[PDB]
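Quick question: what would this complex look like in 3D?
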Amino acid sequence: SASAVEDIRKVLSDSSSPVAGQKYDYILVGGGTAACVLANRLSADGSKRVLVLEAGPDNTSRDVKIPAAITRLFRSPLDWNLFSELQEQLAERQIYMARGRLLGGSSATNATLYHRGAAGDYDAWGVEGWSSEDVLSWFVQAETNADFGPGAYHGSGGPMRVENPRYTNKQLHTAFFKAAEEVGLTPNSDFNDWSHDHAGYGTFQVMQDKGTRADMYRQYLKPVLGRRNLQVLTGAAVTKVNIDGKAQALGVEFSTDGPTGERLSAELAPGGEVIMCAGAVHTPFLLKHSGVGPSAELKEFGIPVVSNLAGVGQNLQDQPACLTAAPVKEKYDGIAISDHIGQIRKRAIASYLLGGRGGLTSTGCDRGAFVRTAGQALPDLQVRFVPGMALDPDGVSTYVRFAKFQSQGLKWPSGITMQLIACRPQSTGSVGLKSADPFAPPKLSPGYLTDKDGADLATLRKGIHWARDVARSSALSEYLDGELFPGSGVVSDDQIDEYIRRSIHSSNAITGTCKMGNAGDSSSVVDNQLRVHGVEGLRVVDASVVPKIPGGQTGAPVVMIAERAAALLTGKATIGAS
Ligand SMILES: Cc1cc2nc3c(=O)[nH]c(=O)nc-3n(C[C@H](O)[C@H](O)[C@H](O)COP(=O)(O)OP(=O)(O)OC[C@H]3O[C@@H](n4cnc5c(N)ncnc54)[C@H](O)[C@@H]3O)c2cc1C
Ligand SMILES: CCCCCCCCCCCCCCCC(=O)O
């Protein structure tokens, strides 16, 4: 009862650890996409104390809410700023792999876009309880659209928010659809509907609420925040899972204020259970540091091997991208133009916010196609059509320069871009360790254009040809001032292949590093129930768990694995046979 004791021990030491004295039945590593879902679900019933440990800040930024601000988000303090390893097969470089560092995670860094892919994508897995039939229902739990309400295929009621994009106000969007209608039999589609083929031109539905970003923080965690049940720790960087014959998860080592550690431990109640949600990048990284991974890889930096699972960090699927762009003949107007000059509009600030949301509702690349380049079982090619002209052959770093475009501006040249993605790529990469330091970046190699048969490079080369075909269509050629971006200089197949490879970039959909398998799956990391093989009380509920990357983008399937898993964990639902 002094004043120095009343301080240097009370207010200070009590405030030192926010986890001292407890006792949690769920500890979520990461406050990203799936984590947000899980926190909502496992905290709903009042009885189970749930803790989420996110390294980033919470999302309060206006740059998250307004979707056109995606550009400002890219090489920012809100991104993990991950760069890969020198890719020999990609002419030196060094590939940037955007990832969210934030509550809501990557769903807050998102290009929005709602894709489930194809029924076949899910059937192609090691299906012990995870067939297209099994997973459809959970897709629907959430949904909530302005595109039907019965559906089969589309629900309403759950917290996700999908809609057709509130900006359209173009004649370049119509120009694209007509150009696609020509250019060879491409029929219209309205995706996610597994009655439909999947291949075809159309609009992508956006993960937005009347033009505002509907990330998983906003939709799952924010309303459920301030439940006595739920402790959300922001700025908390996880170091490892604390483990144990029978390897047993005990909790999680973490650190507020980083490398100047003070290594705190979150403690598990007699129940379970630590569940990983750090993403396809950071989940395998953290597990390797927790001692769960390829032995020898773990031996290399002297960490005790628990489990020994060769699968962790392996089977990284990212779906790479390239680009054709072109300016318009004396038609200076949109989309660059529908919100620039060289300085931000004006009208568009009034259209977004208040006005029920106009252009700047964004993103770019809202609309496009799924295409079979060589009559594959499923479309190998994704086309993303932007009604703006790219100024770099790396689409990501075009966006970065677009954000860096204010007050210095002349005028953004004004035109169109077609981004070409290999949806269901054959090449794979890996996520490893670079040192014994859990605060070091995790050593990525995406392994683009790596497959034996050169299938990825092909699908992408044919994509360029497809794009040019479209550009030369009666409808588009009307608008276009020709000569493209790739260049009239790049004509041969070898010259296309040097261009892509010099220009290849990420369409930002990384999966599969802790893949779910069944029975005796030697390359798998988790079982049927998303367990983790060598360790009890530990699971992954995460993009990392995806056996084969599906067709479109990845958010939607992640917020589905999270739903289904949360249902499994809280009684409510089973997976497989008892
Ligand atoms: C630029 C970009 C655009 C995209 N566009 C689309 C799109 O248009 N449509 C679509 O469907 N999908 C899109 N995606 C994909 C989708 O956002 C992700 O696939 C999905 O969010 C992955 O969910 P996750 O559970 O892995 O969440 P993540 O958000 O990857 O969760 C990881 C979280 O864990 C935290 N974390 C990491 N390490 C630690 C640690 N050591 N301790 C504590 N916390 C940690 C991170 O801060 C992060 O918040 C895009 C992705 C990117 C990067
Ligand atoms: C809304 C800005 C429009 C003007 C800039 C031109 C568009 C750039 C080219 C399109 C490729 C898009 C790459 C983004 C990749 C991603 O979002 O994950």
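Answer marked as accepted. The chain has two domains: 15-142+213-318+430-448+510-578, 167-209+320-423+455-503.
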